[PDB]
Write a protein that binds this ligand. Structure first.
Ligand SMILES: Cc1oc(-c2ccccc2)nc1CCC(=O)c1ccc(/C=C2\SC(=O)NC2=O)cc1
Length: 253
């Protein structure tokens, strides 16, 4: 019944707010109290360290990786609040988070992008898209496909309460490799999909087939993840100098 789907939508929105400090509404408010420092080239980067809290590219990369680690923690905390998730087989829990985390990272990253750049450091900074594109060797191409996805994804005009259900749906795929019991993951996702359908039709009544258009975006996500994993393998052989966080590259298998 509809009353149960709304209750689940409201639960997930509430946990999303608690697990993710920098929401989309806050990011949209900043992008449009206190403006960010805009990093757009070699010198402002170093003024921004003065203002806001080793080659320049790999420096940016090392911080892009530490942010992802931070994001893994928040997604983990958010996953536990999804009704039925902690009751799954512990190995499936790990498997769902292993394969689910990058798709959510890049989904949430779009909340922080416009066509020009991306908010960094809890919104205190803003790094321009073309400065990022101007990095050397293989780094200039780490962020460009995310920008391309964000532009199309952000055109859907989702708000946080929408994204809470969508992130939850991503986590409970069951499509994932290595899963021991797919059926209880699917009953959960099934109910999440029911919740997302009512949510989008109630929130975006004039937005035709938004539900379906949203699920088709789950294809662009798998692709940028694929693209990114390969970009890391290049980094590893180019940069034997440069390490990687064990939370990330153990997920990165
Ligand atoms: C991969 C990822 O995921 C997310 C995210 C966001 C919200 C929710 C979930 C995930 N955001 C990013 C990218 C962040 C951005 O790329 C970035 C971050 C730190 C530095 C560190 C600096 S700042 C300076 O002046 N010098 C530096 O080296 C640079 C760039």
């Amino acid at each position: 019944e509809s009353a149960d789907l709304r209750a689940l939508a409201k639960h997930l929105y509430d946990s999303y707010i608690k697990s993710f400090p920098l929401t989309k509404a806050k990011a949209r408010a900043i992008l449009t109290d206190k403006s960010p420092f805009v990093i757009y080239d070699m010198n402002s980067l170093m003024m921004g360290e003065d203002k806001i809290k080793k080659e320049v590219a790999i420096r940016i990369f090392q911080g892009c990786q530490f942010r992802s680690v931070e994001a893994v923690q928040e997604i983990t905390e958010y996953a536990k609040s999804i009704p039925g998730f902690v009751n799954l087989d512990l190995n499936d829990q790990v498997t769902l988070l292993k394969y689910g985390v990058h798709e959510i990272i890049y989904t949430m990253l779009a909340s922080l992008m416009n066509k020009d750049g991306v908010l960094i450091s809890e919104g205190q900074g803003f790094m321009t898209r073309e400065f990022l594109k101007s990095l050397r060797k293989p780094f200039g191409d780490f962020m460009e496909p995310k920008f391309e996805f964000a532009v199309k994804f952000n055109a859907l005009e989702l708000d946080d309460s929408d994204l809470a259900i969508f992130i939850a749906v991503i986590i409970l795929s069951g499509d994932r490799p290595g899963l021991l019991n797919v059926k209880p993951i699917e009953d959960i996702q099934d109910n999440l999909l029911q919740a997302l359908e009512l949510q989008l039709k109630l929130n975006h009544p004039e937005s035709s087939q938004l539900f379906a258009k949203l699920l088709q975006k789950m294809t662009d996500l798998r692709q940028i993840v694929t693209e990114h994993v390969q970009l890391l393998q290049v980094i590893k052989k180019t940069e034997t100098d440069m390490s990687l966080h064990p939370l990330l590259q153990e997920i990165e298998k």
